[PDB]
């Protein structure tokens, strides 16, 4: 009777004692948490061996500490690794290195369908292509039809093609991201292909989202002869978005919508429903 009550009081006291011990541990971890500390990218998740390559161009072999999970180790992630014991103390915000080197972000366009008119029949096609899948995803899912993840618009911008895109984004309350196609086209060895895989990864994270691509003839030349060799940056970037789009289906998490100043490019490669399904004039 007494024995039980004293063992109970002792349990109540003890939680405090233990709570004190952790308190001690945390102050140490917090002092190491805040930067300046190295970022890194994991490549290999006996020993629990993980390799990280830290941004000082050096590879190290470390054990995994219980202050991270092996489910937080993966490439294309920041992890915080110590300067001097080279052990992954903490895991840092998502996505390694550059988080898309330039994108213009417009988090509410104020465009309305009352700002345009007499484009009515074309308003119906766009709304069917991207909005109807988003809203009634369970209906498309249950039917078993693939739902686009890209739409193609062509025509003049400023007639009201560009305005209506911005308007759809506003109405769904999607993130608008304007990516300009000449920006991708780097003279240095594949920057653009890399930008696009990051463009899509961030797009998947941000969903509902409209990835707005101004110009699709600027990267939409790719040549047809042995001249593609030179202009391989422009072929590769265009191909990389289409492979990604077809690498998933039956989802409408990311929309990509493409715009041209004057159409001069269309390809048999663009076709497929998970790729650029919709062709609006």
């Amino acid at each position: 009777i007494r024995i039980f009550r004293s063992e109970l009081q002792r349990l109540s006291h003890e939680n405090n004692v233990m709570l004190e011990k952790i308190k001690d541990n945390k102050e140490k971890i917090k002092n190491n948490r805040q930067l300046p500390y190295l970022v890194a990218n994991v490549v290999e998740v006996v020993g629990k061996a993980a390799v990280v390559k830290t941004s000082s161009r050096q590879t190290v072999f470390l054990p995994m500490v219980g202050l991270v999970d092996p489910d937080k180790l993966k490439p294309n992630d920041l992890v915080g690794v110590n300067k001097d014991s080279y052990l992954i103390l903490d895991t840092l915000p998502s996505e390694f290195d550059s988080r898309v080197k330039a994108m213009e972000v417009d988090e509410k366009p104020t465009e309305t369908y009352s700002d345009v008119g007499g484009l009515d029949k074309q308003i119906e096609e766009l709304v069917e292509a991207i909005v109807l899948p988003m809203k009634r995803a369970d209906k498309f899912k249950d039917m078993g039809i693939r739902a686009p993840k890209g739409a193609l618009m062509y025509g003049p911008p400023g007639t009201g093609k560009t305005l209506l895109a911005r308007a759809c984004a506003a109405q769904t309350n999607a993130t608008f991201l304007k990516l300009a196609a000449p920006q991708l086209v780097q003279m240095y060895i594949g920057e653009g292909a890399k930008l696009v895989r990051d463009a899509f990864a961030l797009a998947k994270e941000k969903a509902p989202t409209i990835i707005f691509i101004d110009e699709l003839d600027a990267i939409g030349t790719k040549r047809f002869d042995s001249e593609k060799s030179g202009d391989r940056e422009v072929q590769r970037t265009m191909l990389e978005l289409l492979n990604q789009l077809d690498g998933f289906s039956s989802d409408d998490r990311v929309k990509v919508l493409a715009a041209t100043n004057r159409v001069d490019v269309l390809d048999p490669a663009l076709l497929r429903s998970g790729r650029l399904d919709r062709k609006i004039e």
Binding site: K28, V65, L67, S85, L87
Partner: peptide, 14 residues
């Protein structure tokens, strides 16, 4: 957590 502090006392290795 205390054991995790103990791995930090051991050195890096290149």
């Amino acid at each position: 957590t205390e054991n995790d502090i103990k791995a930090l006392q051991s050195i890096g290795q290149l």
